[PDB]
Design a protein around this ligand. Structure first.
Ligand SMILES: O=P(O)(O)O[C@H]1[C@@H](OP(=O)(O)O)[C@@H](OP(=O)(O)O)[C@@H](OP(=O)(O)O)[C@@H](OP(=O)(O)O)[C@H]1OP(=O)(O)O
Lengths: 278, 48, 442, 836, 102, 223
RNA sequence: ACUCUGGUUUCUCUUCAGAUCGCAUAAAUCUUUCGCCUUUUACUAAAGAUUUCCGUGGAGAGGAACAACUCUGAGUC
C-alpha cells in the first residue's frame, strides 16, 4: 500500500541536511507577516492590493464605495495626513483603516520570535553558549538580599537519593540533529505520517510564498505576483461536496473481462500509448 | 531558471526542474480529460 | 419653543438614558447633572437656569443648586404624563366637547393626524386606526393595569409594547400640544420588537403589519400568567368552526373519489381556527371591460363578506395537489370585526391589486346571525358599524394609504388624513379599494 | 462536582488571583493546561492549543486575547487539599492591559508571568509597577522554560544564570516600585514558579523536592527546597548543601538536581526515539504505550512532561503560600478600593468578610451574552450573599450621598458564578467570591457597586476605576445611512459598557468620537461593534490624537471678567507650571483633600514654593489630578477674602470647566499655574449670581492662556521595539521616517534579540508598528504605550501659511494647523479670537 | 519626486488578441516609500539561506554583520576552533575544485 | 423647514441628488448646512406651487449651493452640465491651457472673475448613444450610403451643438470613437463575414463624389 | 509472578464524509455583473450555484497471505 511511513529522527536529520538547498531558512511565521493567505484574502476582498500582492478584479462594481461625495466630516479640509495610509495599514487593521470593510478576513497578529540557533559545526557540543547570544552580567553580588539556608547544620540527604537522571549523557550526538528538526518546515517537522502523491508536492510553493526574491528584474516580480494570484484564487474556492461512493471505475475496468493485467517497462507502455493514440 | 542560474551556474539554458510545470500540466490534463472522454464516447456511440 | 419629547429620550452629549435631564429653555436632553457634568455645562452655556428632570420633570429652580418645577407651566408636564383615569376617561370619551390643544389644534381622540414616516406609512395608519378605538386608548391609559403584567428580562417585546402604548395614550390625551406627533420612537420600537419586520425603512403591507402588531400585543399581555387570554387577543379573538374536508384531488377519477369517500378522506374536520381578523377576498378582476371600455368596476356587494356562512363553507379549493374543501364556518364572532380585503395578490409574474370597489354600506350587519343562527341570542348586538376604513391608493409599487375613522358615540366619521382632518360624508369612500375595515359590535 | 459549590462556602479556601502576561499566548497556554488538568474531558489538539481563555472569536482568529476571561476551578495541592482557584486571565497587549486594570480590583493577588527567553518586557514592567501601586501580592512565573532548554539550547549553567538574572531584574523592579519588606522573591522564598506552560511542565523547588521524595527516600521536601533553590552548592562527600562550594567542578544545587534532569529528559525525547528508549523511560519511572511512542516529537514530549511532572501542584502550593484568602486579604482591598474608609461600620464589617452581614458587591467587568442583546455584570462580592431574585440597589461609579437618584433598584436573576464550564446553575454566592450578576446591567455602565436595598442607608460605592494607560487615539463614527442611526448608537452603548478603556463622547459637532489607547484596541472595538453590537455598516474617519494646550511664558497682562450683576470683576494671570510638577501631581502624589500644612510642607520642601502661595486655595484641575493647578493668590489685605470663601466653590467649578475645555481646540490643558490675582465683588448675595462666575471664570482662563505663550502638546508614546541585532540600525531608520527619537537601546541578556526604547509622537505613531514589521521583512516586533505629553513645535495662534489639503506641513507650522483643524472638527469657531 | 509621489498617492486615495506571455504593466511592487521599497533582507543573523540563492554567493552576499560580531565575541579558544573549521572547509573546497575541470 | 419637517437623525443628506459625472473635489459639497438649505428651498418651492396643477419631484430635481463650504455651482442647462467656479475663491494653479472652460468677466471689473467648465450631460450622451444604436439597428438591408450619411448627420449635429463639451468630456470622446468603430465594423461585416486584418481607411473616408462612404469622424486615425 | 487476551499485511465488494475528505488543485454547465460584443468554439474575471474529474478517509463485508507467533490490557497481580 505504501501509504504510511514510520521513520526515525536521524533520517529526518539527514534528509533535512540534503534538502536545505530547496528549503528556505525561515522558521517563524512572522516572516509571512502580510503574505499569509488571510492577508491576500482581505486584499482581494477590497480594491487595494499590497505592493507585494497581486491585483484583482473586484467582486462587485462597488460604486457606493468608489467615489463618495464630500460630507461634513469626510471633508479632506479637516482630515490631517501625517503619513500616507498605505495598503499595509488597511490590510493590517481592516476594521479600522477601511470605511465599510464588509466581507473581509482576519489576519494573525503576531507569533513569539523563534529564538533558535542553527548548528554550525557538528563536533562542537550542542548545549554551548553561542557567541551570537548576548552575554549576561556575571555580577559577584556579595550582598545576600536573597534568603540563605543554614551553614552545615541541616539538609541531611540520603546517599541513595541520586539527582534523578544520572549516568546518562546530558549532551549526545543526536541532540543537535533533533533540536534542529524540531524547528523544520512542515514536511520535516513530522516524525512519521502518511504519504502524498508525486504530483501534489509543490516544491516551488515555498518560494513565491516568501516576501520577494530580492534583487530580481521586473518580469520576475510580475511572474511571482501572477502565480500568487493563481494560488490565492485556488485557495479561495476549496470545499468538496464530493461524498462519493468510492466506485473505483479504474478497478472495475481492470476486473472487466475485456481487459487483462500484465507487467512491462514504462517506456514500453509509453510507446503502446503512442501507437494507441495514433 | 532565475534560481538555477542564481550564482556560479551559467545564465544559459541549463536548467532542470521540470516537476514544477509537470504537475501543472498533469492537473490541467486531469481537468480536461472528462471532455475528451465524453466526446470520444459520443463518437463511439450511434447518436453522434 | 420646541417640543422634542416625541423623539426618543436620550442624552445629547452622553448618549445615555439614565438621568437624562431636558433643557427647559434650550430644548436639549443631556444625561449630566446640575453640577460638574453635561447638564451643568449646558446650563452655564445656554444660560437656561431651569431644566426639567428625567423622571419627575422638575425644572431647575436654581441654575445648579435645586430642581423644583413650577405648576404654572405644567402643560408640558401633563402632555408628557398621560394620567387620565376612568372618570377622566369618561370626559375623554365625551369627544363632543371642543378639546382644543395647547397650540389651538384639534385633539381628535384616537384619530389625531399625527405625522407618519415617509416609508411604511401603512403601519402608521394601522396603528392610528387601532388607536382610534376608545377602548384602545382606555387600555393604554391604564398604566397600572399594564404594569401589572411582569416583563421578562430576556424579551424586549414588553418594553416596546409599553413604549408604544404610552405614546398612543399621549397622542390621545387632551394635554398634547402639537397635532403632528413624530413616530420615530414608535417606528424604532416596532422595528426592534418585530425583528425588523414591517420596518419603517420600506413600505410594509397593511395586513401583515396589523397581524404582527396584534401578535405582539397578545404576547405582551399573554404568557406564563394565569390570564392566558390576552386582553388585546381576547378583544378581537373570534372562533371559526371550519369543518375542513380533505376532498380528493381533481385528477382523481370518479372511482378514486368513491374510494377516498369510503376512506373518509373528504370527511369534514373542525378546524377551530382562531381567526383574529377576518380575511375576505374580492372576486376576480374584470379582464375585459364590457359596459365602459375605459374602466369597468365590479363592485362587490357587502353580502360577499356575509357569504362566509355558506360561500366559504362551500369552498373546495387549495393550492396543493389535493383540492382541500375549507368548509369555513365562523362560530363565535368577536365584538371587534377586522375585515381585510387583501386586494393585493401575487400572480405568476407580479403582484397586482384588484381595483374593484368595496361597495360596503356603513349600517347594521347580519353576518353573525347567518354564520350561526343560534348564536344570535349570544350576539344580541349584531348591528356593527364600520368604525374605521383604510384604503390604499396609487400604484402597487409607489403607493400610499388614507383612512377615515368615526369617534365612538359621537360618530364624526372624519378622515384621519392630516390635511383632510374633517370629512364626514363618504364622498365615494367605498369606490376606492378599501385596504381594511374595523367595526365594533356595539 | 458539588464540591465546587461546597468549597465556595469556606471563605478561607478561596484564592482570588489575576494573571498577567508578556503576550496573551503564554498566559492562556497556562490557563488551558490548568483547565485540562482540572477537566479531563477537554484535551488540547496536537495541531493547536485549545486556548479556553479566548472566548471571543476575534481573539481566536487574530491570535491575541481580547477580553479577560475569569475562569478557573478547584485545584489540588501536594501538601494541601483542593482550593477553589478563580483566575482572571488577562490579555498580553500594552493597550489591552487596561482591561487587566479591571482585574486589579477583581482580586488582591497578581501571578505575574515572564517569558524565560524573552525576559522582562515593557508590558510586564508596567503591570508589575501597577500591581505594586495597587497593593497586591506578586508571585512570578518563569514562562516558556522550554525555550531556554530547546529553542536556545543554552548550557544548563548558563540557563540557570539567565534565570537568576531575570529573577534579580524582577526583584529590582519590584523594590524600585514598592519599599515593602515582602518584595523578596525567590524559589527559596516561594515567589517564583518555573512553568513553561508548554508540554505541561510546571514546578517549583518544593515540587521538585516532593518528586524526589516520591521517587525514593523520605527527605523532607521543605528543607530540600530551601536548600536546592539557590546557588548554595552541593557536596557529595559531605552529601549536603555546602555554601562554601567545596567541590571544584560541581554545579549549583538547582543546576545539578533540578535543571539537569529536565535537560536530560528533553535531550532524550527530542534527540531520538532510541535516546528516549524504554530503558530511559523505566529509569525515569514511566511506561508509555506504543501508541504514545508512535506520536510526533512535540506530542511525545508533551505527554512525557505532563506524566512526569504531576498536575501543576507546585503552582497551587506557591499560590496558597503567598496569595491570601479573601478573609485575610479583604482588609487591604477595603482600605484601597473603598472611598468610604475602612473605619466605617459597614466598611469594618466588609473588612471581616462576613457572609451574613450587609451585601456589598462591586461589579466592574461587563460580559455580553451569546445573543448579545443583554449583558451581565461580573464582580466580586466583598460582603453579603447575593440571591437569585433578590432586589438590590446598584449605585453607579458616579453615585454619591448628595443625590440618591444616581442609583437604581433592580432584580438579580441567575448568577452563573461558575465560569469554567460557563454554566448558570449557581443560585446564591457567598461573600468574597466573584458573581456574574444578571439583570442589573442596564442601570450601570461600568465599575458600579450593588448593595442591599434597605439593610444599609449610608453605604457608598467604592472608588472609581483608574487606569495606567490614557486613551489618546480618537476616531469618529458615522452610519452609512442615517436612517438607522439609533441602532448603531445602541451598539455604541454596548461598546461603552463592554470596554472600560473605550470612551464614547457625543461631540458638539454631531460626531460620535471613540477614544482608545492603541490602534489594535480601536480595531477590535470596531470589529466588535460591527459584528456583534451593531450589525449596521459604519463609516469612520482617519485616526486622530487628542491634543493638549500648554504654556511656556508668563502672561503679559492681567485678564479680568466682570459678572453681570453690578459689574463684579475678577482679574487673574496665568503662568506656566514649575518643571516636573505635572507628572508629580498626575501621579496622585498630592491630593487637594490633603491638609493645608502637609501640602505647604510638601511644596516648600520639594518645589520650594512660597508658604503663602501654598496656603492659597488650590484647585489642581478636575478631581485634584489635573496638571493645570489653580492657586488663589488674592492679597489678604483686600476685603474679598470673605467673598472668596463665599465664591471658592464657583471659582473651582469655573477652573475645572476651563481645564476640561480650553480656549484652543477646547481640549485638555495641563501644566498651567493659574494664579487668581484678585477679585472685586459686592458682598450682597443677590449680586453673587452662581451662573455669572463660571462663564466669567472660563473667559478669564481663556484670556490668560492667550495672554501667556500658548503651545500645542502631543502624546509621545513609549515603544519597546524588540528586534534582531542586524535590523537594529534599520529599526532606527524607521524612527527616522516617523519623526521618532531613540531613548535607549540594549541587547537582551541571554537572548540574541535586542530591545530599543523609543519615544514616537502619536501623530506619526499610527501604523508605526506596521511600518517597522514590514520594513524589517517580518522580523522586528513593536509595542507602543502612551508615555508623556511633549510640547509640539510652532505656535497654535501664530499666523502661518495654510498647509495643503493633502501634504504634510513643515515642523514650525504643525501647531497652527493642528489647532485650526481641531477647532473646526470639534464644531467650534475655527479662527482664534484674542478678544474672545 | 518622492514628495510629489506621496502627493498623488494621497490624491488617488482621497480624490482574440492572443498574448504569448505575461506583460510588465501588471507589476504592483512599485512603491515610492523608500522604507517599503527598500526592505531589509532577513538574513536571520547569518542564518538566512534562501533556497534558490547560491550558497557561496549568499555567503558573499551576506552583510557579514553577524559574522563580524561573532568573530569579535568569540574567545581565543573559539577563534582557534573557528579557524580550524574554516581551514578544513577550505581543504574540502579545494578537494571538490580539484575534481572539477581536472 | 425644521418645524415643518424635523431632521433629528440628520437624514436629509441620505438621499440627496448630485452629479456623479464631475470629479469628487468639485461635484457637490454635501455639508449639513448646505443640504439643509437645499431641502428648505425645495420645500418652499413645492409649497408655493399647488400639488394639483403641477408638481416638483425631488427624485428628479437638482440643487447646487455656493458658500464658504461649497465653492462651485452646478447647472444642467439645455442638456449640458456646466460648473461655475469663481476665481476669487480658489486658484488651484490657474492657467489657460484647455479650451473646455469659458472666461467670464464683469462689466466694470473687466477681468476674468469666474470660469465655467462645461461638459455634455449624461442624459445627452445617453440620448446620442441611443441614436447611434438606432442607426446601427436599421442595418439589415439599408444602403451603406444611408447608414454613413445618418452617422455623418448625427456626429455633425452633436459637434455643432457642443463642440466645447465634446472636446472637454473625455467620456464623450471615448463613446463616440467606440460607436464609430462599431459602425466601421458593421460596414466591414457587411462587406464580408470575416474581419479584415488591416481594414484600409481609404474606403471609409473617400467622399461620395469620388465614390466612397465619406464618413466624417472625430477620431484620429493615421493613414 | 499467574488466567484470558488473538493479529497485520492484502485483494476486492457496499455504504458515509463529518475531517485543510486533498497541508494539492483542475475542468464543464448554468446564473449576475465587468471588458463585453462579430455568430456560435469561445472568451477576458470575478462573484454565485451545480456537475464531472483526478484522489483520500471513516465504516462494514468477503477471500488470499504470518496464522500461530501472540501484541496487549484486564484477571489482587
Ligand atoms: O521572450 P521572453 O519571455 O521575454 O524571454 C526571452 C527568452 O525566454 P524563452 O527561452 O522562454 O523564449 C530567454 O530566456 P531563457 O533563454 O533564459 O530561458 C532570454 O533569457 P536569457 O537571455 O537569460 O537566455 C531572454 O531574457 P533576458 O534576455 O531578459 O535574460 C528573452 O527575454 P527578452 O525577449 O525580453 O530578451
Amino acid at each position: 500500500t505504501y501509504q504510511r511511513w514510520q521513520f526515525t529522527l536521524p533520517m529526518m536529520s539527514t534528509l533535512y541536511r540534503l534538502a536545505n538547498q530547496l528549503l528556505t531558512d525561515l522558521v517563524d511565521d512572522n516572516y509571512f507577516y502580510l503574505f499569509d493567505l488571510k492577508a491576500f484574502f482581505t486584499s482581494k476582498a477590497l480594491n487595494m492590493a499590497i505592493p507585494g500582492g497581486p491585483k484583482f478584479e473586484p467582486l462587485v462594481r462597488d460604486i457606493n464605495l468608489q467615489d463618495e461625495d464630500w460630507n461634513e466630516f469626510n471633508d479632506i479640509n479637516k482630515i490631517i495626513i501625517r503619513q500616507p495610509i498605505r495598503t499595509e495599514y488597511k490590510i493590517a487593521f481592516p476594521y479600522l483603516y477601511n470605511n465599510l470593510p464588509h466581507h473581509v478576513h482576519l489576519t494573525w497578529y503576531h507569533t513569539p520570535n523563534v529564538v533558535f540557533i542553527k548548528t554550525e559545526d557538528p563536533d562542537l557540543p550542542a548545549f554551548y553558549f553561542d557567541p551570537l547570544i548576548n552575554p549576561i552580567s556575571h555580577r559577584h553580588s556579595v550582598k545576600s538580599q536573597e534568603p540563605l539556608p543554614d551553614d552545615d547544620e541541616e539538609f541531611e540527604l540520603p546517599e541513595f537519593v541520586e539527582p534523578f537522571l544520572k549516568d546518562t549523557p546530558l549532551y549526545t550526538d543526536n541532540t543537535a540533529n533533533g533540536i534542529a528538526l524540531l524547528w523544520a518546515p512542515r514536511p520535516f517537522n513530522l516524525r512519521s505520517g502518511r504519504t502524498r502523491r508525486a504530483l501534489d508536492i509543490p516544491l516551488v510553493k515555498n518560494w513565491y510564498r516568501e516576501h520577494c526574491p530580492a534583487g530580481q528584474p521586473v518580469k520576475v516580480r510580475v511572474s511571482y505576483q501572477k502565480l500568487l494570484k493563481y494560488y490565492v484564487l485556488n485557495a479561495l474556492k476549496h470545499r468538496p461536496p464530493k461524498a462519493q461512493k468510492k466506485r473505483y471505475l479504474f478497478r472495475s475496468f481492470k476486473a472487466t473481462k475485456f481487459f487483462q493485467s500484465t507487467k512491462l517497462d514504462w517506456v514500453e507502455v509509453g510507446l503502446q500509448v503512442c501507437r494507441q493514440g495514433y | 531558471y532565475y534560481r538555477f542560474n542564481t550564482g556560479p551556474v551559467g545564465k544559459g539554458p541549463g536548467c532542470g526542474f521540470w516537476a514544477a510545470g509537470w504537475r501543472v500540466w498533469l492537473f490541467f490534463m486531469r481537468g480536461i480529460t472528462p471532455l475528451l472522454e465524453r466526446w470520444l464516447g459520443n463518437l463511439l456511440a450511434r447518436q453522434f | 419653543s420646541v417640543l422634542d419629547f416625541d423623539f426618543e429620550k436620550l442624552c445629547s452629549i452622553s448618549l445615555s438614558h439614565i438621568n437624562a435631564y431636558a433643557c427647559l429653555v434650550c430644548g436639549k436632553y443631556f444625561q449630566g447633572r446640575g453640577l460638574k457634568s453635561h447638564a451643568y455645562i449646558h446650563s452655564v452655556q445656554f444660560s437656561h437656569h431651569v431644566f426639567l428632570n428625567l423622571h419627575t420633570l422638575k425644572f431647575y429652580c436654581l441654575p445648579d443648586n435645586y430642581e423644583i418645577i413650577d405648576s404654572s407651566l405644567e402643560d408640558i408636564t401633563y402632555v408628557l404624563k398621560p394620567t387620565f383615569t376612568k372618570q377622566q376617561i369618561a370626559n375623554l370619551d365625551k369627544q363632543a366637547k371642543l378639546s382644543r390643544a395647547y397650540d389651538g389644534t384639534t385633539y381628535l381622540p384616537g384619530i389625531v393626524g399625527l405625522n407618519n414616516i415617509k416609508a411604511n406609512d401603512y403601519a402608521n395608519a394601522v396603528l392610528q386606526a387601532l388607536s382610534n378605538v376608545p377602548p384602545l386608548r382606555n387600555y393604554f391609559l391604564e398604566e397600572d393595569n399594564y404594569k401589572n403584567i411582569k416583563r421578562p428580562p430576556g424579551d424586549i417585546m414588553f418594553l416596546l409594547v409599553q413604549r408604544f402604548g404610552e405614546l398612543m395614550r399621549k397622542l390621545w390625551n387632551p394635554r398634547n400640544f402639537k397635532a403632528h406627533v413624530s413616530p420615530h420612537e414608535m417606528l424604532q420600537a416596532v422595528v426592534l420588537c418585530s425583528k425588523k419586520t414591517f420596518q419603517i425603512t420600506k413600505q410594509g403591507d397593511g395586513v401583515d403589519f396589523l397581524s404582527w402588531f396584534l401578535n405582539a400585543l397578545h404576547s405582551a399581555l399573554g404568557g406564563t400568567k394565569k390570564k392566558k387570554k390576552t386582553i388585546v387577543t381576547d378583544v378581537f379573538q373570534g372562533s371559526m368552526r371550519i369543518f375542513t374536508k380533505k376532498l380528493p384531488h381533481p385528477d382523481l377519477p370518479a372511482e378514486e373519489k368513491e374510494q377516498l369517500l369510503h376512506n373518509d378522506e373528504y370527511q369534514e374536520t373542525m378546524v377551530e381556527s382562531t381567526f383574529m381578523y377576518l380575511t375576505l377576498d374580492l372576486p376576480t378582476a374584470p379582464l375585459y371591460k364590457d359596459e365602459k371600455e375605459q374602466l369597468i368596476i365590479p363592485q362587490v356587494p357587502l353580502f360577499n363578506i356575509l357569504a362566509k356562512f355558506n360561500g366559504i363553507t362551500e369552498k373546495e379549493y387549495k393550492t396543493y395537489k389535493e383540492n382541500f374543501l375549507k368548509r369555513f364556518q365562523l362560530t363565535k364572532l368577536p365584538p371587534y370585526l377586522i375585515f381585510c380585503i387583501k386586494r393585493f395578490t401575487k400572480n405568476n409574474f407580479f403582484v397586482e391589486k384588484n381595483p374593484t370597489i368595496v361597495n360596503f354600506p356603513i349600517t347594521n350587519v347580519d353576518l353573525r346571525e347567518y354564520l350561526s343562527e343560534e348564536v344570535q341570542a349570544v350576539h344580541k348586538n349584531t348591528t356593527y358599524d364600520l368604525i374605521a376604513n383604510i384604503v390604499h391608493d396609487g400604484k402597487p409599487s409607489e403607493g400610499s394609504y388614507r383612512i377615515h375613522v368615526l369617534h365612538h358615540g359621537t360618530g364624526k366619521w372624519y378622515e384621519l388624513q392630516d390635511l383632510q382632518v374633517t370629512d364626514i360624508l363618504p364622498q365615494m369612500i367605498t369606490l376606492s379599494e378599501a385596504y381594511i375595515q374595523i367595526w365594533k359590535r356595539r | 462536582m458539588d464540591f465546587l459549590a461546597d468549597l465556595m462556602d469556606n471563605s478561607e479556601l478561596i484564592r482570588n488571583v489575576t494573571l498577567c502576561g508578556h503576550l496573551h499566548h503564554g498566559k492562556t497556554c497556562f490557563v488551558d493546561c490548568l483547565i485540562e488538568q482540572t477537566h479531563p474531558e477537554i484535551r488540547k489538539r496536537y495541531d493547536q492549543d485549545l486556548c479556553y481563555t479566548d472566548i471571543l472569536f476575534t481573539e481566536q482568529e487574530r491570535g491575541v486575547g481580547i477580553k479577560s476571561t475569569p475562569v478557573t476551578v478547584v485545584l489540588p495541592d501536594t501538601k494541601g487539599k483542593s482550593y477553589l482557584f478563580n483566575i482572571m486571565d488577562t490579555p498580553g497587549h500594552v493597550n489591552f492591559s487596561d482591561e487587566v486594570t479591571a482585574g486589579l480590583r477583581i482580586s488582591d493577588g497578581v501571578v505575574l508571568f515572564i517569558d524565560a527567553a524573552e525576559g522582562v518586557m515593557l508590558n510586564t514592567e508596567r503591570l508589575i509597577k501597577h500591581a505594586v501601586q495597587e497593593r497586591l501580592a506578586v508571585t512570578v512565573c518563569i514562562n516558556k522554560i522550554d525555550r531556554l532548554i530547546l529553542e536556545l539550547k543554552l548550557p544548563p549553567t548558563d540557563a540557570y544564570y539567565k534565570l537568576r538574572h531575570i529573577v534579580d531584574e524582577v526583584n529590582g523592579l519590584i523594590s524600585m516600585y514598592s519599599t515593602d519588606e515582602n518584595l523578596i522573591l525567590s524559589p527559596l522564598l516561594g515567589n517564583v514558579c518555573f512553568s513553561s506552560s508548554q508540554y505541561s511542565i510546571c514546578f517549583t523547588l518544593g515540587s521538585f523536592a516532593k518528586i524526589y521524595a516520591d521517587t525514593f527516600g523520605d527527605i523532607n521536601y521543605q528543607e530540600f527546597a530551601k536548600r536546592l533553590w539557590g546557588d548554595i552548592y552541593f557536596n557529595p562527600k559531605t552529601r549536603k548543601f555546602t555554601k562554601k562550594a567545596p567541590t571544584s567542578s560541581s554545579q549549583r544545587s538547582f543546576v545539578e538536581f533540578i535543571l539537569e534532569p529536565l535537560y536530560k529528559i528533553l535531550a532524550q525525547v527530542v534527540g531520538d526515539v532510541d535516546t528516549s528508549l524504554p530503558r530511559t523511560l523505566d529509569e525515569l519511572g514511566i511506561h508509555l504505550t506504543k501508541e504514545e511512542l508512535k506520536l510526533n516529537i512535540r506530542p511525545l514530549l508533551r505527554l512525557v512532561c505532563k506524566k512526569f511532572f504531576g498536575e501543576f501542584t507546585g503552582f497551587v502550593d506557591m499560590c496558597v503560600q503567598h496569595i491570601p484568602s479573601p478573609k485575610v486579604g479583604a482588609k487591604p482591598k477595603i482600605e484601597h478600593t473603598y472611598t468610604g474608609g475602612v473605619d466605617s461600620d459597614l466598611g469594618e464589617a466588609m473588612s471581616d468578610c462576613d457572609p451574613d452581614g450587609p451585601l456589598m458587591c462591586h461589579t466592574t467587568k461587563m460580559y455580553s451574552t451569546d445573543d448579545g442583546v443583554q449583558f451581565h455584570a461580573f464582580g466580586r462580592v466583598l460582603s453579603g450573599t447575593i440571591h437569585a431574585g433578590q432586589p438590590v440597589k446598584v449605585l453607579g461609579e458616579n453615585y454619591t450621598l448628595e443625590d440618591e437618584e444616581d442609583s437604581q433598584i433592580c432584580t438579580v436573576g441567575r448568577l452563573w458564578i461558575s465560569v469554567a464550564r460557563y454554566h448558570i446553575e449557581v443560585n446564591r454566592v457567598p461573600a468574597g467570591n466573584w458573581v456574574l450578576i444578571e439583570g442589573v446591567d442596564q442601570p450601570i455602565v461600568k465599575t458600579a457597586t450593588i448593595t442591599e436595598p434597605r439593610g444599609n442607608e449610608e453605604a457608598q460605592i467604592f472608588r472609581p476605576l483608574k487606569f495606567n494607560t490614557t486613551s489618546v487615539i480618537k476616531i469618529a463614527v458615522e452610519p452609512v445611512n442615517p436612517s438607522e442611526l439609533p441602532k448603531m448608537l445602541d451598539g455604541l452603548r454596548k461598546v461603552n459598557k463592554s470596554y472600560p478603556s473605550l470612551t464614547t463622547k457625543v461631540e458638539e459637532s454631531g460626531e460620535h468620537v471613540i477614544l482608545g489607547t492603541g490602534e489594535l484596541y480601536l480595531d477590535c472595538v470596531m470589529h466588535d461593534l460591527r459584528k456583534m453590537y451593531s450589525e449596521i455598516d459604519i463609516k469612520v474617519a482617519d485616526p486622530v490624537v487628542t491634543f493638549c494646550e500648554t504654556v511656556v511664558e508668563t502672561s503679559s497682562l492681567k485678564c479680568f471678567a466682570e459678572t453681570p450683576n453690578k459689574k463684579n470683576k475678577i482679574t487673574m494671570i496665568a503662568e506656566p507650571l514649575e518643571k516636573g510638577l505635572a507628572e508629580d501631581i498626575e501621579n496622585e502624589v498630592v491630593q487637594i483633600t490633603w491638609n493645608r500644612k502637609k501640602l505647604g510642607e510638601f511644596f516648600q520642601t520639594k518645589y520650594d514654593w512660597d508658604l503663602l502661595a501654598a496656603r492659597s486655595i488650590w484647585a489642581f484641575g478636575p478631581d485634584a489630578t489635573g496638571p493645570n493647578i489653580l492657586v488663589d493668590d488674592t492679597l489678604p489685605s483686600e476685603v474679598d477674602k470673605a467673598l472668596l470663601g463665599s465664591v471658592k466653590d464657583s471659582i473651582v467649578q469655573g477652573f475645572q470647566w476651563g481645564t476640561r475645555e480650553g480656549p484652543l481646540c477646547d481640549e485638555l490643558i495641563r501644566n498651567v499655574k493659574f494664579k487668581i490675582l484678585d477679585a472685586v465683588v459686592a458682598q450682597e448675595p443677590l449680586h453673587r449670581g452662581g451662573g455669572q462666575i463660571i462663564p466669567t471664570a472660563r473667559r478669564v482662563v481663556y484670556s490668560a492662556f492667550l495672554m501667556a505663550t500658548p503651545r500645542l502638546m502631543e502624546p509621545y508614546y513609549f515603544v519597546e521595539v524588540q528586534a534582531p541585532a542586524d535590523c537594529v540600525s534599520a529599526v532606527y531608520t524607521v524612527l527616522a521616517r516617523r519623526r521618532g527619537h531613540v531613548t535607549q537601546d540594549a541587547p537582551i541578556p541571554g537572548s540574541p534579540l535586542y530591545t530599543i526604547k523609543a519615544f514616537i509622537p502619536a501623530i506619526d505613531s499610527f501604523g508605526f508598528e506596521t511600518d517597522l514589521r514590514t520594513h524589517t521583512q517580518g522580523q522586528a516586533f513593536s509595542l507602543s504605550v502612551f508615555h508623556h505629553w511633549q510640547i509640539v513645535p510652532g505656535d497654535p495662534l501664530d499666523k502661518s501659511i495654510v498647509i495643503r489639503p493633502l501634504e504634510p506641513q513643515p515642523a514650525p507650522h504643525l501647531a497652527r494647523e493642528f489647532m485650526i483643524k481641531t477647532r473646526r472638527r470639534k464644531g467650534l469657531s475655527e479662527d482664534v479670537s484674542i478678544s474672545k | 519626486k518622492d514628495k510629489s509621489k506621496e502627493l498623488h498617492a494621497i490624491k488617488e486615495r482621497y480624490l482574440r488578441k492572443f498574448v504569448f506571455e505575461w506583460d510588465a504593466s501588471e507589476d504592483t511592487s512599485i512603491d515610492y516609500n523608500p522604507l517599503y521599497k527598500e526592505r531589509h533582507q532577513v538574513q536571520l543573523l547569518g542564518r538566512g539561506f534562501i533556497a534558490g540563492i547560491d550558497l557561496k554567493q549568499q555567503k558573499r552576499e551576506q552583510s557579514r554583520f553577524y559574522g563580524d560580531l561573532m568573530e569579535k565575541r568569540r574567545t581565543l579558544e573559539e577563534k582557534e576552533q573557528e579557524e580550524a573549521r574554516l581551514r578544513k572547509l577550505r581543504k574540502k573546497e579545494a578537494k571538490q575544485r580539484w575534481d572539477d575541470r581536472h | 423647514y425644521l418645524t415643518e419637517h424635523p431632521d433629528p437623525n440628520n437624514e436629509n443628506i441620505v438621499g440627496y441628488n448630485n452629479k456623479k459625472c464631475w470629479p469628487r473635489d468639485a461635484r457637490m459639497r454635501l455639508m449639513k448646512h448646505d443640504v439643509n438649505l437645499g431641502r428648505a428651498v425645495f420645500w418652499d418651492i413645492k409649497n408655493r406651487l399647488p400639488r394639483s396643477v403641477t408638481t416638483v419631484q425631488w427624485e428628479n430635481s437638482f440643487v447646487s449651493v455656493y458658500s464658504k463650504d461649497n465653492p462651485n455651482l452646478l447647472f444642467n442647462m439645455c442638456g449640458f452640465e456646466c460648473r461655475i467656479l469663481p476665481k476669487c475663491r480658489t486658484s488651484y494653479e490657474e492657467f489657460t491651457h484647455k479650451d473646455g472652460v469659458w472666461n467670464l468677466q464683469n462689466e466694470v471689473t473687466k477681468e476674468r472673475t469666474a470660469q465655467c467648465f462645461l461638459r455634455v450631460d449624461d442624459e445627452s450622451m445617453q440620448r446620442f448613444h441611443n441614436r447611434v444604436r438606432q442607426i446601427l439597428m436599421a442595418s439589415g438591408s439599408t444602403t451603406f450610403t444611408k447608414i454613413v450619411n445618418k452617422w455623418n448627420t448625427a456626429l455633425i449635429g452633436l459637434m455643432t451643438y457642443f463642440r466645447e463639451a465634446v472636446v472637454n468630456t473625455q467620456e464623450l470622446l471615448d463613446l463616440l470613437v467606440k460607436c464609430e468603430n462599431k459602425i466601421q465594423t458593421r460596414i466591414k461585416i457587411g462587406l464580408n463575414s470575416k474581419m479584415p486584418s488591416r481594414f484600409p481607411p481609404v474606403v471609409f473616408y473617400t467622399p461620395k463624389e469620388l465614390g466612397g462612404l465619406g464618413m466624417l469622424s472625430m477620431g484620429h486615425v493615421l493613414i
